[PDB]
Amino acid sequence: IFSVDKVRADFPVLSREVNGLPLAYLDSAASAQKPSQVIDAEAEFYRHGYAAVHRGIHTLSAQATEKMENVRKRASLFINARSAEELVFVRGTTEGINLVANSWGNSNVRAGDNIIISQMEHHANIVPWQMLCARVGAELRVIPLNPDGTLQLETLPTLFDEKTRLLAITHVSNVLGTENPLAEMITLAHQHGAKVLVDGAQAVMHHPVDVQALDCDFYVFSGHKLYGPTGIGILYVKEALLQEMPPWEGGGSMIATVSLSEGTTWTKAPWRFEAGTPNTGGIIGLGAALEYVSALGLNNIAEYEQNLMHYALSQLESVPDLTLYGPQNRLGVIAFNLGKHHAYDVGSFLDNYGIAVATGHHCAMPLMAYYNVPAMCRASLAMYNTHEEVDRLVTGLQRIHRLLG
Amino acid sequence: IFSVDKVRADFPVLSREVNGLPLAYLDSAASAQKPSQVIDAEAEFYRHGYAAVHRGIHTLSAQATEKMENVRKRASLFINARSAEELVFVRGTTEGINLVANSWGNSNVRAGDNIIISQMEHHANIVPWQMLCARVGAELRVIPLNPDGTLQLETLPTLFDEKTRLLAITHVSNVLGTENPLAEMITLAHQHGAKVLVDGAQAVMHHPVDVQALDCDFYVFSGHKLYGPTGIGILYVKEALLQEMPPWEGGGSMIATVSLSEGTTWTKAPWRFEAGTPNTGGIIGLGAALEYVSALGLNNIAEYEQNLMHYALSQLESVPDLTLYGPQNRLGVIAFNLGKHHAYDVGSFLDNYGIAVATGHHCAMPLMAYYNVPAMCRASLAMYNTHEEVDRLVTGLQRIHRLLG
Ligand SMILES: [Cl-]
Ligand SMILES: [Cl-]
């Protein structure tokens, strides 16, 4: 079983006070807090083992290089990639999507082709493909939404055709909490010889993830939402695709040879896509993050979070004029608006109670447009959140409605 | 005055033992050690103040956003940029050069144009321009070297012409320690209407740097060589150039509006070049790094390092068959080879004494080719290094020559 009290004891931020009152951090979907196991792992690496990696033969450099590639191996096992050489270190989901869109997109998407995204995508999974479609002269098609925050799956027959090069789709919606039927969609996209990039930024922290079972071609997530440091993320690519992709960033540690008269040659995959000094501090911290999350066990986290989510949805039923967005089985987040009050105002009042929720468009303006609102509130319910905090959210919304209605 | 003993007391790694023996870290040019002021600043941010930045109205998010943009202001003052809005956060020198090469290069370098780099450049300042010249059909010209590791400045008349769009030049050579006459070269390049990108990865830690006085158009350096965290760096661009450059990475926090039917619009400069979640942990640590280096005072560091360098060059005179590369007034590093022994072997013996030096090509293969060697040894002498450690280097080379000659 899961003991949220013991978990919270690992997170020094959770003892913080905001505005005189004790913090209720309900915004892990924007970024997650970090346990001192993660913070100290990075700190102790800087304190005792720091060196440049890959180049260099001295001891610290060799031991730091070992640490880095061990984290690549642990990450590849976390998402059940066949090989650690299928994982590329990136700054996060957004750089990972940009890397695919340039390295792979530019050499596999011709004028007259089409790419499919969905109306619920984060901006990280829209703007790169808009840029690619503009560069090559292709069309960006959109899987539309149902009122309940699920995909209109019946539109796929009209979006997919022989010219469909790529489907880029989210695993879990950072706003609605919808989880998309990735296995079956990837089957369909593969029947047309299309690849699938999966945005898994909001999945990898809520339940186990198996990229061999999904058969996705690319998968991306971010360290800082997995209870880890900022400035680090993972891009997974099928070995056969990755070996064919050209470099994106150029510089040191991705060349084989540099000549000013006979040109330059690239090293083999993963390392060909990693230019300059890696974020070694971030990688070490991400590795601790994977160790920490695996020790609690994702299936235990999934259960605790599923029960907290149920408790919340049940309690919110007693908030007047509350509008929820998204499906009943949402993961991680609750998207809502309070009567006719603007979300910015509702969020301000909740922050005044010391409750941190997200407000605005959540880098998903097309989703806001579909629901014909400018903004929503989003509350995250993560493995370190409590029924007590759910109650403070509910009371607070009640008080806001009384005060402002 | 400078007190290297008190400085070293800030650096927990310097107490490390390697191979049973006490560490002599002579490889800060590859990456620098970090003081606990830097390590703890990042750690305390994760521990007490962590949130997502820019989006969000709650307290932690607003205070984290303040911290981030204050570091942008402190960085802009460190290099004497006119405006903090002229600085872009990047992963380091290599991403910063790639950003200019794509965002600015692709829209200002046409087929038939030429770009000038130098033979002493790091790979970060070669491979991006080779990629750009291949994309657009331009020519990469090279300022050649003199035997002493300085530029053959008399070749500039034949390299510069009306078609010269850009000079990309290093401030200090990561290998030879040469410092290039940037002020005068930028004058010349500006007379032809060419812009200058300066690679300052090896300058900003050795003496003050003033981008208004240099009149450079772009400048780049890396956090981890400035006694700071990995995964963070600064790209400086003149306000007028930066406002004209198009985005590079696309995603959240660089849009103004995202529409799936009317396209997307970009936000204003700096922020248009920063997609997704920033490396907030890195930025906080870089900010502490700038605070720490400014407290010692760059001119004090420059003096201590200049005297240590003189002491070393003087002592190395008593090493038989030692070949040095580079000018007499080198900054930061000493590049050498021991008799006919391969640098990898010499570095292995020094690491066995617990002395960490760099060996190989130092991501500067064209420089190795000019000196008709495959590799060199490089020893860094930074503000926390001692005359005692110089002696261990000298003794060690002597012992290596006796043993292996
Ligand atoms: Cl290299
Ligand atoms: Cl956005």
PDB file of C-alpha atoms and ligand atoms in Angstrom, chain A residues 122-124 127 361-365, chain B residues 55 251-258 276, ligand 2:
ATOM      1  CA  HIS A 122      -0.248  21.107 -25.977  1.00  0.00           C
ATOM      2  CA  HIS A 123       1.504  23.878 -27.900  1.00  0.00           C
ATOM      3  CA  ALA A 124       4.708  21.780 -27.823  1.00  0.00           C
ATOM      4  CA  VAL A 127       3.885  24.659 -33.125  1.00  0.00           C
ATOM      5  CA  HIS A 361      -4.997  28.488 -21.386  1.00  0.00           C
ATOM      6  CA  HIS A 362      -2.427  25.864 -20.243  1.00  0.00           C
ATOM      7  CA  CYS A 363      -0.546  26.179 -23.519  1.00  0.00           C
ATOM      8  CA  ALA A 364      -3.605  24.639 -25.201  1.00  0.00           C
ATOM      9  CA  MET A 365      -5.414  27.558 -26.844  1.00  0.00           C
TER      10      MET A 365
ATOM     11  CA  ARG B  55       2.475  31.023 -16.712  1.00  0.00           C
ATOM     12  CA  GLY B 251       6.118  25.429 -28.528  1.00  0.00           C
ATOM     13  CA  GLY B 252       4.658  26.971 -25.405  1.00  0.00           C
ATOM     14  CA  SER B 253       5.863  30.277 -23.921  1.00  0.00           C
ATOM     15  CA  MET B 254       7.014  31.667 -27.276  1.00  0.00           C
ATOM     16  CA  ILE B 255       3.581  32.022 -28.936  1.00  0.00           C
ATOM     17  CA  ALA B 256       1.320  35.034 -28.719  1.00  0.00           C
ATOM     18  CA  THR B 257      -1.640  33.104 -30.194  1.00  0.00           C
ATOM     19  CA  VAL B 258      -2.035  29.493 -31.415  1.00  0.00           C
ATOM     20  CA  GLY B 276       8.892  25.032 -23.198  1.00  0.00           C
TER      21      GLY B 276
HETATM   22 CL    CL C   2       1.972  29.085 -24.628  1.00  0.00          CL
END
